[PDB]
From a paper:
Based on the catalytic mechanism of the NcEgt2 enzyme, we found that pyruvate, one of the products in the catalytic reaction, fits well into the electron density map. In the structure of the MsEgtE-PLP binding pyruvate complex, pyruvate binds in the deep crevice of the active center via extensive interaction with surrounding residues. Specifically, pyruvate forms salt bridges with Arg348 and Arg337, and also binds to Gln183 through a hydrogen bond. Besides, the carboxyl group of pyruvate creates hydrogen bonds with Tyr48′ of another monomer and water molecule. In the α14 of MsEgtE, Arg337 directly interacts with the carboxyl groups of the substrate's cysteine part and forms salt bridges. Tyr48 on α3 of MsEgtE, occupying a spatial position similar to the Phe48 in NcEgt2, participates in pyruvate production with the same function as Arg75 from α3 in NcEgt2.
One of the key steps in the ergothioneine-biosynthesis pathway, the C-S bond cleavage reaction, uses the pyridoxal 5′-phosphate dependent C-S lyase to produce the final product L-ergothioneine.
Residue numbers in the entry:
A (entry chain A): -7 to 371
B (entry chain C): -4 to 371
Write the structure that this text describes.
């Protein structure tokens, strides 16, 4: 632990200048990032085009953008474009899948599982088991492998990057371990897509638009491999469906903001254009730099090991400060945007709430130091 | 008569982008005004300036104003109103939440996907008595409901497939007498019929007569009913302290599109709801008149229906879907082809639907008439 300086990458700056100017300081891209000028205009145009030719004729004519969106998502998760369906977001995604799941509804997940995920699982009548993990919450693959062969489950659900902690989970090696026990794997990549290599052999993946891909709100994607999609049994319409259509078509049924979906196609486009590997290398670096700067703040400890290939850093208060009030103070008084993660976010891992830092590629050591600074004079 | 000069229609046309050709499809997706589009773009910009959720917090006055405009149109309270992805999301939220015996009466012309959601939620469905136009007979229904009660009545006050205006008010007071609550599907009716009729729950879609952004709906539930409801998610035996209506409104959504919608309802109250309805009723009359005389097509709706939905049944076996494509590709005229799946227990034969807003002229209706006769 001899501190290392920031790599200079023109990517940081290109990204800052393709997006509206921040009013204060935004360290919250793990909750809602920032839409590029291009993503904002593309959304606005679809809405204008709806007024000039009609909503549904506009939507039919947007099919090339929407399909490019599915193909971009597909290229990142190593699926096909036609395995990929649109969604309101990741919780819409997990519900559509678990609500559709045929036969014995039993699953194993991390104890650090997202609280609204556990909520969906139980609401769809799943039995949920914890997988073995280390002191950080990172799955033990050897043991998880032994556990799954002896005591199988109908599906393992893996959140490859938790909303509440910047540990990158060994997604790929867990997936072969599960396939080695004949068990499918669903990945919650709400935080992982556009941040971690999500090309790991998974049977289903879902993510949200508004996070690291910097898409509009109200959009997610759900990808299912065709072996698994055909076995699925959607809730709407009912199985006796006079209307005939595939599973993915049923799962994609419903009114949605189509402008936001073309918005989202542009934003995935921008991530491919920037280079997925370069953007991931830089986010790993943002995490490191973030943990270097915050290593010595009195009243706060850094939770993540320093070199986790992630941009998510979490601070547990060492004198029982309430992250929520520190967050409200940092906004009202310093224009700095963070997230306070309550216990409810991962009720089977978190003993104490945490303040979360999730900057995108455009953050500077200067700005991290300014956050460090503001965090010290908090009342 | 019909040469009414109405300034509302002209302001409404000029408040909005220029339609390429002719748009007679406001029952499927209307046209957002420059203000609604601007308000949506501005919320997305603000998210980028101050962060998504701090922007959503700042937007509360506009969001609540939206709930409160909706409340004034249906005679509910703002705090009874909850946002939704649209109307099918609404009905699913309400029926999946329904406690005790799941039994229900509705019209034989019920929305296909409404019946889909009813069946998916383990409801038994009985048909309500109706005349030849599929219009509920309220007295019959009263007797019917006394003799065989039902947990709730689901009235679609205006159908997607036909411009009949259902006697919502009188039906509500009859169901209420039999002690049975009434849910109204008002996706077509909100901004169109008077929807202040004492219903127990009402829902609607942003993109139709209110000309709001797509991806938004409203679901209003009276407090007496709301607190008896048992949402699917989170499960009823969980320890997060939220009200039922907070549970039904949980979830990733396009917040920009909701402030857009609040501007759209705003523009409807500003224009004067009564004046906008009297004018939609007029547009229906002119439509059914100008189209009374068209080889290959009979007008389905009595001329006097207070509605801008007129539907056309082909007399010589044309497929409305192809006529709609032809009309778009070859005349730039937008319409909707209603298939049987839209009302599977009322429709024997599919129909072509026009749903023009307040801004259509006798001229444009004659052009549509003309284009319809030279249709290969
Ligand atoms: C944000 C998030 C979700 C939920 O995404 P929505 O789009 O809000 O439904 C699920 N899992 C993780 C890890 C998240 O960060
Ligand atoms: C369009 C429509 C619906 C469903 O609206 P969505 O917003 O697409 O869910 C329901 N009822 C009627 C009468 C409709 O016209």
């Amino acid at each position: 632990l001899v501190p290392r300086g920031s790599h200079m990458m023109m990517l940081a700056q290109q990204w800052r200048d393709a997006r509206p100017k921040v009013a204060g300081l935004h360290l919250d891209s793990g909750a809602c990032s920032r839409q590029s000028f291009a993503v904002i205009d593309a959304t606005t145009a679809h809405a204008r085009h709806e007024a000039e030719v009609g909503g549904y004729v506009a939507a039919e004519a947007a099919t090339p953008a929407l399909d490019a969106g599915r193909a971009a998502v597909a290229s990142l998760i190593g699926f096909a474009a036609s395995d990929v369906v649109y969604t309101s977001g990741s919780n819409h995604a997990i519900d559509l899948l678990l609500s559709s799941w045929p036969g014995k509804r039993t699953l194993a997940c991390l104890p650090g599982e997202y609280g609204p995920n556990l909520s969906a699982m139980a609401a769809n009548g799943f039995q949920v088991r914890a997988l073995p993990v280390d002191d950080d919450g990172r799955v033990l693959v050897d043991e998880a492998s032994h556990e799954l062969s002896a005591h199988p489950v109908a599906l393992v659900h893996l959140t490859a990057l938790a909303s509440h902690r910047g540990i990158a989970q060994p997604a790929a090696e867990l997936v072969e371990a599960c396939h080695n026990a004949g068990i499918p794997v669903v990945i919650d990549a709400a935080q992982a897509l556009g941040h971690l290599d999500c090309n790991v052999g998974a049977d289903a993946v879902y993510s949200s638009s508004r996070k690291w891909l910097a898409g509009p709100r109200g959009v997610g994607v759900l990808a299912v491999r065709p072996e698994l999609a055909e076995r699925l049994q959607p809730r709407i319409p009912p199985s006796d469906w006079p209307i005939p259509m595939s599973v993915l078509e049923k799962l994609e049924l419903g009114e949605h903001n189509a402008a936001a979906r073309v918005g989202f196609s542009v934003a995935v486009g921008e991530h491919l254009a920037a280079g997925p590997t370069a953007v991931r290398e830089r986010l790993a670096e943002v995490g490191r730099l973030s943990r270097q700067v915050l290593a010595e703040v009195d009243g706060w400890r850094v939770v993540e090991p320093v070199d986790q290939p992630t941009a998510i850093t979490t601070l547990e208060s060492t004198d029982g400060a309430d992250p929520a009030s520190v967050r409200s103070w940092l906004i009202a008084e310093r224009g700095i945007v963070t997230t306070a993660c309550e216990l409810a976010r991962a009720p089977f891992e978190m003993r104490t709430p945490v303040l979360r830092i999730s900057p995108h590629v455009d953050v500077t050591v200067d700005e991290l130091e300014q956050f460090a600074a503001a965090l010290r004079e908090a009342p």
